[PDB]
A paper describes a structure:
The system is controlled by a peptide, AimP, that binds to the regulator AimR, inhibiting its DNA-binding activity and expression of aimX. AimR is a transcription factor that in its apo peptide-free form promotes aimX expression.
In order to validate our proposed mechanism of action, we solved the crystal structure of AimRKat in complex with a 45 bp DNA fragment (AimRKat-DNA) which includes the aimX-boxKat with the two 6 bp inverted repeats recognised by DBD domain (identical to the ones recognised by AimRSPβ) and a 25 bp spacer. The AimRKat-DNA asymmetric unit contains two AimR molecules arranged as a dimer and one duplex aimX-boxKat molecule. Overall, the structure is similar to AimRSPβ-DNA (RMSD ~2.1 Å), however, RMSD differences are not constant throughout the entire molecule. RMSD differences are minimal in the N-terminal part, which is bound to the DNA, and increase towards the C-terminal domain. As could be anticipated from the sequence identity between AimRKat and AimRSPβ (almost 100% for DBD, TPR1 and TPR2) and the identical inverted repeats in their target DNA boxes, both proteins bind to DNA using equivalent interactions. Meanwhile residues located in TPRN-ter are involved in the 25 bp spacer binding by mainly polar interactions. The high A-T content in the 25 bp spacer allows a small DNA bending of around 20° towards AimR interacting surface.
Author numbering:
A (entry chain A), B (entry chain B): 1 to 386
The structure:
DNA sequence: GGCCATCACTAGATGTTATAAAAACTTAATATTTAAGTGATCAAC
DNA sequence: GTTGATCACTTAAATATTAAGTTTTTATAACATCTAGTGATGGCC
């Protein structure tokens, strides 16, 4: 018997009003399906949200271990298990996802075989075990029946397009999606609407189109309770405001930090961004990590020194970092800081060049603003960012 | 009976030494296969070059009519017909190609079905009836057996990559090709070596990498006597020299013009390029078309006027052209000419902008050289071409 | 006496399975055709 | 008497086709599982 059913049975023995409340949360008109859920082994709900809404409302602090145990006990032949796969992948619960894919490939149900295979392609592609042509070929081979995996196979490609910065082909795949084809599984339809909106959000930020980027980040947030999509949407909104509005930047970053509670990985994104936002706007900065070997953290300590007019100590530390292997996007920030200390145009030109080589359409604005103040042709500096 | 066999039979009745000479040209160690070719209906050669070499050596002035008739009378179920398809496509003989594909799709031979289908994908893709994901999926679906169409399906994608200026994925597909897999059909292996060398040549010219571009254009020329590959290789070498070496530019264009004799379409590429080369280097220009409505021809008459210091007549004509819908690459050249007449930096800035928007990494050098003379920071101008 | 949890029936819309029908797919085993030898046969000279 | 065009043998390697033994689609049909109603039964107040 699944931990979720044990914990619901224990709680209902105490507070006998819970079933009508669980129905409301599960979107059920009456709780007969929930009595059937607690009473009869391997009962499932038509829509996987019935179970997720409840695990979320009622046992939030144990969502992983509960949904793991429930997902890893499901009939892989069933719509529930195809939904579990989307929930697994959307939250980046790989142990669960890979396990559900394994079972669904070698299973007897044609829908669950399809979903299982297409998710394997998405997994292999995102990990870097295959390129987009291999992937797009494995899709073609699969002879996809369902509107669901027709849409999702286009989306798994949109993710690889997003990794390579490639707007034109992403939008080409996006034009071909009509989510109103998804009729069987409304959990997927809604989870895919969140994915598309997050995707559009990240490609528009990358194409340095800030107003659309927020429009789509907000649609994503309206439409979801999934931690991963909330964290990234607020990060994307936070970054959309770095140069235009310090409070909206800080506000969206802090909201995203709340939603990342107990995922140090997700929390560091916000801490590092808030570190940079505050140093950039010359504010007291509580987010610095004075203990970190990481080039990015050592840069923010240098940037604070520069803001505190400790130019000689900043230059001593920057020249120690030159002795050290840095990627191009790091050297972009290096020469920008060497620029702020020395007021040498050459440093800013290298900063612009390194950001240009790293395909960073956002950081490049930093050394370009300094070059416009030092009197370089604005019309030329604009041409560099096109 | 095929026209090629009629005309070979007629000529041999006159000069009875021809068979041993035709064998040498056909790469045959003795002419028994050629007696079998003339004597017995539907005899074919192991390698389609045996027949092409001869039609080329012996009846050059009627190569289309002869090879059409021979190709469109072949057993589509045979290696010859799969070779005819490559020869059809390589020379852009679409009437023949599409006809051979039609017959090979609905035929009973597994190899000739495969080749027939893969060429349809290449045709649909190049024409713009499908995008690269559709194509890459149709390949995946086809369950390709043969090393030949494994390599060719990668190549048909490299053509779409080339159209969209996408170096990274082109080279990714290229890394995966090993032509030493082709064991059955040495005609395809050699024809594909020419295609990939031409492909590499055009992508490197586009990435403004001129020495590699020539290296590959030259390998292509070594490896072939196909008009279309010769024409484009010499055009590519011609263009590779436009800014660096006027004589090598003019020389390679003129060689390519000889090889284009009697294809007005191919000849216009050379005439228009020689028109521009001569105007650019301020030489007497015989190639101008004073009669043409075409924006690019009217630009070269303006450019000659500018070289002859008839600036007021040049400005009158340029201002007529503004009244007129032009693509971005045309407006790039427009503002460059408006620049040369008026000495207005704004015109050169627009020229740089329009070349940048049209992804023309070669023409952009033109307005950039003017901006460097007018005193603009060369270190900044270099960053624009990164 | 009324309300409210419980929960098995129930109707009907939906989702799953299973069970032959018809296609596409290996495979291996002949069967054709190929280049290039060998050797008449007639012409030439 | 020699030569060299002609051509059908030939052999042995390579290309092709047929066949029949496996998977794989398919579809129309026959069965389970859903949600949300209905109604029972029993605490509770």
């Amino acid at each position: 018997m699944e931990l979720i059913r044990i914990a619901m049975k224990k709680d209902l023995e105490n507070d006998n009003s819970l079933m009508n409340k669980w129905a409301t949360v599960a979107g059920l008109k009456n709780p007969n399906p929930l009595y059937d859920f607690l009473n009869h082994d391997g009962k499932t709900f038509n829509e996987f949200s019935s179970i997720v809404n409840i695990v979320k409302s009622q046992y939030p602090d144990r969502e992983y271990e509960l949904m793991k145990d429930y997902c890893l006990n499901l009939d892989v032949k069933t719509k529930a298990a195809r939904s579990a796969l989307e929930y697994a992948d959307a939250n980046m619960f790989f142990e669960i996802e890979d396990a559900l894919i394994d079972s669904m490939i070698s299973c007897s149900n044609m829908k669950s075989k399809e979903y299982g295979k297409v998710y394997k392609i998405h997994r292999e592609l995102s990990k870097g075990e295959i390129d987009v042509f291999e992937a797009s070929a494995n899709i073609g081979k699969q002879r996809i029946k369902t509107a669901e995996m027709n849409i999702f196979s286009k989306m798994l490609l949109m993710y690889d397009c997003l990794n390579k910065g490639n707007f034109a082909p992403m939008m080409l795949l996006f034009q071909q999606i009509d989510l109103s084809e998804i009729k069987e599984n409304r959990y997927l339809k809604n989870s895919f609407e969140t994915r598309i909106n997050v995707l559009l959000s990240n490609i528009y930020l990358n194409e340095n189109n800030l107003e659309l980027c927020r429009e789509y980040a907000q649609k994503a947030i309206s439409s979801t309770d999934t931690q991963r999509f909330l964290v990234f949407s607020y990060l994307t909104i936070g970054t959309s405001y770095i140069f235009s509005d310090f409070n909206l930047s800080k506000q969206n970053y802090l909201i995203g930090l709340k939603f990342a509670k107990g995922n140090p990985g997700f929390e560091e994104f916000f801490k590092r961004n808030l570190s940079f936002l505050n140093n950039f706007w010359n504010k007291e900065n509580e987010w610095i990590n004075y203990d970190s070997d990481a080039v990015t953290d050592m840069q923010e300590v240098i940037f604070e020194l520069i803001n505190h007019k400790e130019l000689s100590k900043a230059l001593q530390l920057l020249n120690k970092l030159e002795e050290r292997d840095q990627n191009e996007n790091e050297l972009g920030f290096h020469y920008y800081l060497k620029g702020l200390i020395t007021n040498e145009k050459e440093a800013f030109f290298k900063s612009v060049e390194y950001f240009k080589a790293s395909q960073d359409k956002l950081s490049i604005k930093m050394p370009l603003i300094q070059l416009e103040k030092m009197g370089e042709n604005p019309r030329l500096l604009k041409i560099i960012t096109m």
